[PDB]
Amino acid sequence: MRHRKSGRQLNRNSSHRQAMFRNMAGSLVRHEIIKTTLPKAKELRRVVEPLITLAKTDSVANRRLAFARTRDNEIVAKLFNELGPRFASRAGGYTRILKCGFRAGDNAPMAYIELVDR
Amino acid sequence: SNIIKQLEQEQMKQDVPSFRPGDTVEVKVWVVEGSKKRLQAFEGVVIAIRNRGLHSAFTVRKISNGEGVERVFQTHSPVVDSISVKRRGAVRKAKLYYLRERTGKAARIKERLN
Amino acid sequence: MIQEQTMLNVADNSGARRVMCIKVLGGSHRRYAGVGDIIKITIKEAIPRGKVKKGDVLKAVVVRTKKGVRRPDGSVIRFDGNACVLLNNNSEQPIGTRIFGPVTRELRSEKFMKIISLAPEVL
Amino acid sequence: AVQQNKPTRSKRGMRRSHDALTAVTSLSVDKTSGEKHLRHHITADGYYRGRKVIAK
Amino acid sequence: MIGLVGKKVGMTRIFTEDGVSIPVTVIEVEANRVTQVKDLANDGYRAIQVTTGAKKANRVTKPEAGHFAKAGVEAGRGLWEFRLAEGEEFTVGQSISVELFADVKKVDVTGTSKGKGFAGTVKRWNFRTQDATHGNSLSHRVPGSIGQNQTPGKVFKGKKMAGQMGNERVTVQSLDVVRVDAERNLLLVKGAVPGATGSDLIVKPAVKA
RNA sequence: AGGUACUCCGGGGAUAACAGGCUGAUACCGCCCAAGAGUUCAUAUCGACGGCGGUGUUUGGCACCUCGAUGUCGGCUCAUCACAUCCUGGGGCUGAAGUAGGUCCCAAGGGUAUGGCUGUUCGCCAUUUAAAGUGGUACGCGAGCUGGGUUUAGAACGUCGUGAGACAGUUCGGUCCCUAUCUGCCGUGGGCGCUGGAGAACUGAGGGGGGCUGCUCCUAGUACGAGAGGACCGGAGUGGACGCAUCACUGGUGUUCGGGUUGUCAUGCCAAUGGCACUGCCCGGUAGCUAAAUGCGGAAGAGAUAAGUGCUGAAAGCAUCUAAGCACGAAACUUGCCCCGAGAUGAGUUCUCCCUGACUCCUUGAGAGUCCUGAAGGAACGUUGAAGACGACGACGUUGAUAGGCCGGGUGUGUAAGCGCAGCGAUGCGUUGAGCUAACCGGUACUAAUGAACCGUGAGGCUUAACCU
RNA sequence: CGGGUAAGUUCCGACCUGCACGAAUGGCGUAAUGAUGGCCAGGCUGUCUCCACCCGAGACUCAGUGAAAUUGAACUCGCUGU
RNA sequence: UCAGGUAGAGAAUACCAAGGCGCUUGAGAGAACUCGGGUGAAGGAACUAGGCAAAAUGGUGCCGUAACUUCGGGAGAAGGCA
RNA sequence: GUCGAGUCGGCCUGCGCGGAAGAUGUAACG
RNA sequence: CCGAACCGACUAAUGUUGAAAAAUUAGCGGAUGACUUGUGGCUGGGGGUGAAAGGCCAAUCAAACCGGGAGAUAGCUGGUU
RNA sequence: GCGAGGGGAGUGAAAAAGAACCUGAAACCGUGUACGUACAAGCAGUGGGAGCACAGCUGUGUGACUGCGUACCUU
Numbered sequence A: 001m002r003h004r005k006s007g008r009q010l011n012r013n014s015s016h017r018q019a020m021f022r023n024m025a026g027s028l029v030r031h032e033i034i035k036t037t038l039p040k041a042k043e044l045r046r047v048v049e050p051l052i053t054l055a056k057t058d059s060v061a062n063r064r065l066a067f068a069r070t071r072d073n074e075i076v077a078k079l080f081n082e083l084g085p086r087f088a089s090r091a092g093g094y095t096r097i098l099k100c101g102f103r104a105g106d107n108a109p110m111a112y113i114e115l116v117d118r
Numbered sequence B: 001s002n003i004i005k006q007l008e009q010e011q012m013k014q015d016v017p018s019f020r021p022g023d024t025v026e027v028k029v030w031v032v033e034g035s036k037k038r039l040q041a042f043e044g045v046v047i048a049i050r051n052r053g054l055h056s057a058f059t060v061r062k063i064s065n066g067e068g069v070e071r072v073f074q075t076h077s078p079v080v081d082s083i084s085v086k087r088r089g090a091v092r093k094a095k096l097y098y099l100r101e102r103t104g105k106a107a108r109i110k111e112r113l114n
Numbered sequence C: 001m002i003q004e005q006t007m008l009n010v011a012d013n014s015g016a017r018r019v020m021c022i023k024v025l026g027g028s029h030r031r032y033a034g035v036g037d038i039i040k041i042t043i044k045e046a047i048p049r050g051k052v053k054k055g056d057v058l059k060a061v062v063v064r065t066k067k068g069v070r071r072p073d074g075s076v077i078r079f080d081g082n083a084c085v086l087l088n089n090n091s092e093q094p095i096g097t098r099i100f101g102p103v104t105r106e107l108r109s110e111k112f113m114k115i116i117s118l119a120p121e122v123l
Numbered sequence D: 001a002v003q004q005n006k007p008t009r010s011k012r013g014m015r016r017s018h019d020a021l022t023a024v025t026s027l028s029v030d031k032t033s034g035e036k037h038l039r040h041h042i043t044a045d046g047y048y049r050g051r052k053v054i055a056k
Numbered sequence E: 001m002i003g004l005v006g007k008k009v010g011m012t013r014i015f016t017e018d019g020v021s022i023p024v025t026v027i028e029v030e031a032n033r034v035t036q037v038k039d040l041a042n043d044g045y046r047a048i049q050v051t052t053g054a055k056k057a058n059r060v061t062k063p064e065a066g067h068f069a070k071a072g073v074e075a076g077r078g079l080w081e082f083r084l085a086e087g088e089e090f091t092v093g094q095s096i097s098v099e100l101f102a103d104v105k106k107v108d109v110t111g112t113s114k115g116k117g118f119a120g121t122v123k124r125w126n127f128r129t130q131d132a133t134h135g136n137s138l139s140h141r142v143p144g145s146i147g148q149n150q151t152p153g154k155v156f157k158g159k160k161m162a163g164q165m166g167n168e169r170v171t172v173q174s175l176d177v178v179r180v181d182a183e184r185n186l187l188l189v190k191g192a193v194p195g196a197t198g199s200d201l202i203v204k205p206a207v208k209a
Numbered sequence F: 001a002g003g004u005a006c007u008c009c010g011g012g013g014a015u016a017a018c019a020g021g022c023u024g025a026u027a028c029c030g031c032c033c034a035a036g037a038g039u040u041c042a043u044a045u046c047g048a049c050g051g052c053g054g055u056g057u058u059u060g061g062c063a064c065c066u067c068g069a070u071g072u073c074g075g076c077u078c079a080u081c082a083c084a085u086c087c088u089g090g091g092g093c094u095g096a097a098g099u100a101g102g103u104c105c106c107a108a109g110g111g112u113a114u115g116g117c118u119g120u121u122c123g124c125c126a127u128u129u130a131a132a133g134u135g136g137u138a139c140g141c142g143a144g145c146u147g148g149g150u151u152u153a154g155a156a157c158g159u160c161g162u163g164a165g166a167c168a169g170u171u172c173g174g175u176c177c178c179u180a181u182c183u184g185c186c187g188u189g190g191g192c193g194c195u196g197g198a199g200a201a202c203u204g205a206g207g208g209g210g211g212c213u214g215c216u217c218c219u220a221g222u223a224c225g226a227g228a229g230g231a232c233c234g235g236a237g238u239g240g241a242c243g244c245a246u247c248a249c250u251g252g253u254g255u256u257c258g259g260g261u262u263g264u265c266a267u268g269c270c271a272a273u274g275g276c277a278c279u280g281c282c283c284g285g286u287a288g289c290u291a292a293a294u295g296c297g298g299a300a301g302a303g304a305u306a307a308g309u310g311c312u313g314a315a316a317g318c319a320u321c322u323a324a325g326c327a328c329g330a331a332a333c334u335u336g337c338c339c340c341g342a343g344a345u346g347a348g349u350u351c352u353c354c355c356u357g358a359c360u361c362c363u364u365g366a367g368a369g370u371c372c373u374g375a376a377g378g379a380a381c382g383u384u385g386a387a388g389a390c391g392a393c394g395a396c397g398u399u400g401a402u403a404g405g406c407c408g409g410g411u412g413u414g415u416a417a418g419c420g421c422a423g424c425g426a427u428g429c430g431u432u433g434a435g436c437u438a439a440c441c442g443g444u445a446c447u448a449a450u451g452a453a454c455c456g457u458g459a460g461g462c463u464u465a466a467c468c469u
Numbered sequence G: 001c002g003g004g005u006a007a008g009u010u011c012c013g014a015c016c017u018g019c020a021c022g023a024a025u026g027g028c029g030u031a032a033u034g035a036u037g038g039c040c041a042g043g044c045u046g047u048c049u050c051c052a053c054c055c056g057a058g059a060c061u062c063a064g065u066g067a068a069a070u071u072g073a074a075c076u077c078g079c080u081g082u
Numbered sequence H: 001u002c003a004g005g006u007a008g009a010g011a012a013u014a015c016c017a018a019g020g021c022g023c024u025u026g027a028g029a030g031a032a033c034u035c036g037g038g039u040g041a042a043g044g045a046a047c048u049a050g051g052c053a054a055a056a057u058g059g060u061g062c063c064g065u066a067a068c069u070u071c072g073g074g075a076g077a078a079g080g081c082a
Numbered sequence I: 001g002u003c004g005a006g007u008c009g010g011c012c013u014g015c016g017c018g019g020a021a022g023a024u025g026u027a028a029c030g
Numbered sequence J: 001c002c003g004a005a006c007c008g009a010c011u012a013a014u015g016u017u018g019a020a021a022a023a024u025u026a027g028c029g030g031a032u033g034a035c036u037u038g039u040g041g042c043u044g045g046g047g048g049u050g051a052a053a054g055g056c057c058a059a060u061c062a063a064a065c066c067g068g069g070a071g072a073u074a075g076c077u078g079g080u081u
Numbered sequence K: 001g002c003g004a005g006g007g008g009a010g011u012g013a014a015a016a017a018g019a020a021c022c023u024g025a026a027a028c029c030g031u032g033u034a035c036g037u038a039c040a041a042g043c044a045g046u047g048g049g050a051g052c053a054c055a056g057c058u059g060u061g062u063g064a065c066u067g068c069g070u071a072c073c074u075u
């Protein structure tokens, strides 16, 4: 049973999952749109959108939290200097997912995920 | 959740004093022996607190007549007549289960000055 | 929560120091004895000139347990060890004359009133 | 564990009576580009619900 | 004696003044609305059909809406029947409230138990496990033997095996009625009842009593 | 003349060891006669000398099946039946005062120990229990587990033998394979049917589950008894074991939350952080799942009975429970309780909803085709769920709280960072119960749930009644 | 027979009635040594009472590739009998 | 044959350098059951042929250490403190 | 003594009754 | 003596149409010696070699492998249009 | 896909003689049509037999329902 549980295992262990979404969150902030599998995209929302919410309040402590969660200073700078202000009046929902068919190699269901003002 | 909130709010005590893990508290509980009702004191260190609304509880540890005893009180129970802090303790942890392996000098808790 | 093979301390001055439960009395397949339950015991350690000897088989009433007792409001009382009071195998009256440490109100019955009266504290 | 008797071609077909594929019920038509597409998916040219959502 | 349809709100406790904590299941019983009365002449048996709660119009089909409209009542979230005793009478469109239980001491509560999915024999039927060690090969939670030998040469019907567990109708009998609160549409029964929070419950006066 | 357990080939179920079969001497269980025992008294209880059966349970006889293989003793797991009944229920007789027994009859609903020793089954012992039943099921169960014993190859002792070797003598060591086609069984779907289509609520043929019991108290120290002792009947409470549900409480888990900390590498460095070391090691803990947690259950009642007890009553002027007639009588039976259930093809009922076009051809009929039409509803797709292996089932799709985010709260952890102060410094203190906080609660259209398209039709056979036209 | 255990067909100490020990196919002892055989205790624990939860890899679904033993023929049910 | 850094007695071990790699099916899901692991209330060998497996102990310095002995041992006995 | 027409128990013989408990399911007329 | 490399193989689980015709994983023994290892040499089938298990002598051992006597013989089993 | 493979064109008496090449059997696997088949229990046939389709009352195909019916070899 998994009654009321949240989060996808994605056939990984916990440290792999955490590292993967740290990399993928960085790619989405950097490129503003990426293509990935539909389940990974849905999981990425719960990682990236709290980072943008954090970036709405610029302070030393918040930059350090964001650095702790991304480990990339170029990503932290873009979060606080660009994305935070771009989304300052939006109450959540900073990303959108667009389904785009099936991967050739393994028939995986694919999707684009982008920032909503891209 | 408003229905159960209303049912729980009307039963909650309004005079529970503030206390922390590490404090020494005295709890007065009702004891019935036949037709008579009287208050019995239980005084010791608060080693755990469960904050859960009407279901709040706290655990008090004492060494009584050569034996360690723990009592888990249900905070809003009418069996508990009153609670009072005798001494304020200075600890770091929320739960002081490590005191179960300590006696005498090793089980002392520094006083919290404030 | 006492079962066969559980070792218990002795809360009296009968002379026994350590006893082992060898039967939970009072029912087929009965698993556990708690506070206020009668068990069969064997004496595993005794003081030299006491009233009972190592290897004796007799009865006892459990008076303190680590699992504890629940009260009608949901509260719990737990002790640091398991302890019992030795009883005569036939009359089920205590063998010692003194009781050590606290006991609980679960003993407040006609059968164990002597224990209640001798105890230094009843919780 | 293994069969004692060779199953027949009839029984083989009966087992496969649930294997047939199902065609897509119907495709959707983009209101701007007129492309057909899987419903709730973008078109081959990058439209969704009439908006050019992605380049190429 | 008829029952009422309610909703499992959750569990809590009622402290009494004498120091007892009573665990209770909180059941919300909104007004049950009589949608059809069945009788011997037309239906061969005596019962009422009730509805309760509310339903959004665009999820009410035309066959359902016409049935509610004939009774003159607003659509509820479902329909349930209760057989009538010999001296019981109701009329279509009548509302029945939780005050029905005002003087009822004990009730039976029926619900759909929580779903455990596919369950093994240890959990489903309380089978004992085999050795964790002492040489056991791949057979720690498995069922063991399932029959005899050449006689009878088959497995008997009703053999206890793994399969779906829970998610089925269950009745718990003879629960104390702790409080009837008609102003808040509340029924408080002592103890637990089947089903998850939010699920439908059927409450009737206890059959054993 | 011998050995082979270091072994080998050709054969045999022509022929043994296991299990089946036939048989029933033997075994076990009934019964008949009644010498006697029992103060008297054959029959309360035993029953000598002898007699007659039943079972298929023992030890055996036979050699019919299997030697181109039907794996063994014991344990473990899971059972199922019989009744010659161990407990509980009902009863007759007693050498039955009571309590407690003896013996026989009825009764198979449910229940029916844990340990020490030994490979043990068994048995003895310790301590329980209402009781610790007897048997059948390949001495039930190794394509379910074990492998201690028996029964390969190593080695030794006693013993036998000149010796190789041997011994249901002993001793230490010694590979247990199989991905389930069919039957069966547990679950879960798809198809078509049920006669116009569709959405619901049902009826209940039939099936399954459940059915155990202790102790204390009252009745009552009453009845009984010289005392010692000590009830029936009836009532109340509280347990054991078992079962179902649940998570409010008490707790476990909680690699998705917070903190402490060792070694090391990195982010330029300080400070702050991250990676790796079993989650590095640990301390706490939310939701969920859960037992040790806490609610509930076994029934009462009814019907027809078993053994047994009777009423009235002749045959047979009496007597007689029986022949006619009438009445009691048990956990067994049929119900009552819970669940499934119309594929119940004997395919049932009730409520509601929907469809009221045109034409042509033919072999002329429950015929075929084209045009127009496309309902109720369904499905699909999407967002999903204390629903779930997949199907299925439930919620929701902008006329929207379905999921994520967001806002507020709760909970958990336990006073973040930065700055300042004190101290030589480790560190302490202030800002500060701070900061962070999953699955929780209450809100909120910010994101994603698209207009459509698809399936499903167009008033529903014949015959005969009844009623009206 | 004694010891150990509530209880000990094993173990230890004895007795001698050695079925069928016995002196280099050596007798009786023996400190140390042994992945050697037997027995007991402290610690320790999911071995067990009695299992619960969790993390991973399979099992399950989708896409790609794609085996095996076996097989007289099958329209391959229960029971009681034969 | 060669043998860097930090910790370390070390060529053990942990994390790294130079250098080299992610192991030639993937994507989901988050049932039973199997495999490899983590934690567990109360009890603590009751398990079993047998404590099998697991849990546990574990370093350095110092204090201290019995029977027995072939005088070497036994001995890191045991136990304890920092 | 009353009561007023049958009564009693051997033998042989036909058919029946009890004696009569078993294991997956009626299951000892197919 | 403790313990890596190196040489072994006591226990358990897995695996048993294996990743492997003897392994993997966690533990285990020896580890300056009757030690271990490279290269080359020698011993030949009733023969070798053997700290001895009938062990080993190319995945073969109570008498190796290959070819020949050879279509050994088969009072046995199968089959025979 | 500057593929594989194929369709045309052309050669030839013939290309279902196209190089995976004379003939091209059987097992085995398909597409199309006719009839049967979703209340029915077993060596699957045989005797009886309705209905439907087809070709000219008959011939062919199918076979509802029903009596009977446990393969072959060896030993």
Ligand SMILES: [K+]
Residues within 6 Å of the ligand: E123, E124, E125, E126
């Ligand atoms: K269960």
Ligand SMILES: [K+]
Residues within 6 Å of the ligand: none
């Ligand atoms: K010979």
Ligand SMILES: [K+]
Residues within 6 Å of the ligand: F005
């Ligand atoms: K031999």
Ligand SMILES: [K+]
Residues within 6 Å of the ligand: F024
């Ligand atoms: K016989």
Ligand SMILES: [K+]
Residues within 6 Å of the ligand: F024
């Ligand atoms: K016989």
Ligand SMILES: [K+]
Residues within 6 Å of the ligand: F030, F031, F053
């Ligand atoms: K008899």
Ligand SMILES: [K+]
Residues within 6 Å of the ligand: F066, F067
């Ligand atoms: K044989």
Ligand SMILES: [K+]
Residues within 6 Å of the ligand: none
């Ligand atoms: K049995």
Ligand SMILES: [K+]
Residues within 6 Å of the ligand: none
């Ligand atoms: K009885």
Ligand SMILES: [K+]
Residues within 6 Å of the ligand: none
């Ligand atoms: K009797």
Ligand SMILES: [K+]
Residues within 6 Å of the ligand: F108, F109
């Ligand atoms: K019975």
Ligand SMILES: [K+]
Residues within 6 Å of the ligand: F118, H049
């Ligand atoms: K043993």
Ligand SMILES: [K+]
Residues within 6 Å of the ligand: F122, F123
């Ligand atoms: K024996």
Ligand SMILES: [K+]
Residues within 6 Å of the ligand: F019, F138
């Ligand atoms: K057998």
Ligand SMILES: [K+]
Residues within 6 Å of the ligand: F142, F176
């Ligand atoms: K086996």
Ligand SMILES: [K+]
Residues within 6 Å of the ligand: F142
């Ligand atoms: K066996």
